[PDB]
Structure 1
């Protein structure tokens, strides 16, 4: 649905490179917890046992509405790992829809390199599809349950604002979160939020690769990942191109690898020397595509003026992480098996440049990886 979701606006907080989170309550009576919003996974899991980096955690023994599934689960992430016990309980989202649903919950009892010290989040809400749920696809993911048990429409939208805060609009599309119009790309397959990139540009200049290279072996939208991550081949070409475009200043070879910071006196970052990056995505009409363009203010992340280069290599395909998303209002329109992009009303920019979403472009031919 469309309108004004004034109670849901600004319901996200983050700690800069540590993830965006929403407040949720579980159990009876309600226990409160901060939950990482992760479009790149499908399990709802919460710490359920003391751990050095948890201020609080879920206490199953205090919930009258708790139920044990008498089954264990473990998950490894691109980053870390946790193990737990499956169960169900009542779940609410205070600054969300006014509903309460029964959902599956992994009670996290052991973990390594998962809970980030000082992140202030205690759990994870995987918003992807059941196909990538652990132990298997029979564990209904949270959002599925929310849609089946209430009249919340099958759809949510995300405006992540860098600098961390933002908005998770559950069930609708809030028009005050974007300017211009919304462009949609088909979701290739309901597992991850898979999309297809058909062309890449650095400051208008085409990288000029077979478009299969761009989606090998998949391209995804993943709010649980900080960086823009590109297949090694695409990554090398892009960094070459980006180096060429910012030559008026030279940087340690290890800046381009994420291994070193770079700094400028306060408020003098030479943004203009850095090119803009553009991904063309497949449109909904045949042979049409559209373009999203991000600024250096997106791929150069600030670090407690200092910056880390937030584009990196991947062997698991393209991950359009938070670097990409912070430019845009992103609509995960699941009812319609599409994802929408519009210019974020909150994205960070200077006076000379802004993120963009333009289209349509005629595009010939095939870009998706097949098994």
Structure 2
């Protein structure tokens, strides 16, 4: 009910589905930039040279506290890549914790399909662990520096509100950002925020696949990835079930592949014809699990309107992956997600801002009895 972390509420913004960003100030004197919050990587990097899609960038020569590490860095993502130069400088988050730390910072001088036109962000904050940092795990990630240099608790939480804003509470949890209880799943290993999915249902119907398939390779929580990405075999079965569940209206095959869009007269989108999707996650007690359920409002994403027209176009945001399951924004937008690094667990609760209608709502329910969950993980 109360809120000691009130100043961190609503500290995230977004340019209509182009990424959620927080303001970060680097150097001396102060240089504030919009930084994308990414739990799917571990490097803190900022544009440091002009670029057509950047309104501003980091000017190292103007920062008296900047220290060049004399080493380059290259970071390739599922989408895009950039090259830069490593260094360290003072960093603070205006609408985040009341501290200032010296952190590693990669100055991006060149990039390919990384920055997004009109997104309004100029850098990225990799919140994952050192194991996946580039060039190697010796480059301490921003959050590791924050925790080592200050007394800020080793935990952060994200409330991503879709359609653009949200909140990144650093060092704690804010109760006004969620309703109901928080359910926790173990962080299986500290590299990506890896978790274990034990069951999948479409409108209450079990997909009936060996749970090993759901985590083949791995399953992670990634705020830097837009879609809910599933391994090939899982994607195919999911689409077949979703199509069967939404048979009231037929769509072209390309729609389910994200190649085609479907638009409806403003305010006439028949959400009711689309099914809800439930992912069951391993719990904190033996043989116990819980489930998170999303609505079509989460997996059917709006596409930048033509020009304030009377047509709402949507893209099916569930796609395939060859590197495991990626629970991106499609999943996160329906919940308040707690990255409890201190206790190696991730909590989920219904978000106070998730988009829904008068008939159905996103949900987090439990507990359920699921046996042999340990075997679901890939070795």
Which TM class, normalised by the smaller chain length? over 0.9
Would the aligned equivalents of 1:4 and 1:176 in 2 still touch at CA under 8 Å? Answer: no
Give distance in 1, aligned partners of 2:126 and 2:16: 20
Is the CA contact 2:203–2:275 (under 8 Å) kept in the aligned structure 1? Answer: yes
Q: Return the alpha-carbon distance in structure 2 between the equivalents of residues 3 and 199 of structure 1.
A: 35
Return the offset for 1:2: 9.6
Q: What is the count of residue pairs matched by the alignment?
A: 370
Q: Which residue of 1 aligns with 2:59?
A: 59
Q: By how many angstroms is 1:4 displaced?
A: 3.3
Alpha carbons of 1:321 and 1:2: their partners in 2 closer, same or farther (altered >3 Å)? farther
Cα distance in 2, alignment partners of residues 231 and 165 from structure 1: 30
Which stretch shows the higher mean deviation, 1-10 or 320-329? 1-10
TM-fit CA distance, 1:17: 2.8
Conservation of the 8 A alpha-carbon contact between 2:2 and 2:176: no
- Partners of 1:68 and 1:88 within 8 A in 2: yes
Shift of 1:50: 1.1
CA RMSD of aligned residues (A): 1.1
Secondary structure of the structure 2 residue equivalent to 1:41? coil
Q: 1:196-230: per-residue Cα shift (whole Å, max 9, x none)?
A: 00000000000000000000110000000000000
Work out whether residues 13 and 165 of structure 1, in 8 Å CA contact, stay in contact via their aligned partners in 2: yes
1:36, 1:67 → 2: CA distance? 23
Preserved CA contact (<8 Å) 1:37 1:224:
yes
Decide whether the 8 Å contact of 1:58 with 1:107 is kept in 2. yes
TM-score, length basis structure 1: 0.99
Alpha-carbon distance, 1:263 to partner: 1.3
Output one character per residue of 1:83-125: Cα deviation in whole Å (capped at 9) or x when no partner: 0100000001000111100000001111111111111100000
Structure 2: how far apart are the matches of 1:97 and 1:80?
30
Unaligned segments of structure 1, at least 5 residues: none
Query: Shift of residue 5 of structure 1?
Result: 1.0
**Per-residue deviation, 1:3:** 4.8
Structure 2 gap segments, 5+ residues each:
305-311
Distance 2:16 2:378 in 1: 33
In the TM superposition, what whole-angstrom CA distance separates every residue of 1:339-365 from its partner, at most 9, and x where no partner exists?
Answer: 000000100000100000000000010
Instruction: Give the 4+ runs in structure 1 shifted more than 3 A.
Output: 1-4
Of 7-16 and 121-130, deviating more is: 7-16
How does the TM-score come out when normalised to structure 2? 0.97
Q: By how many angstroms is 1:16 displaced?
A: 2.5
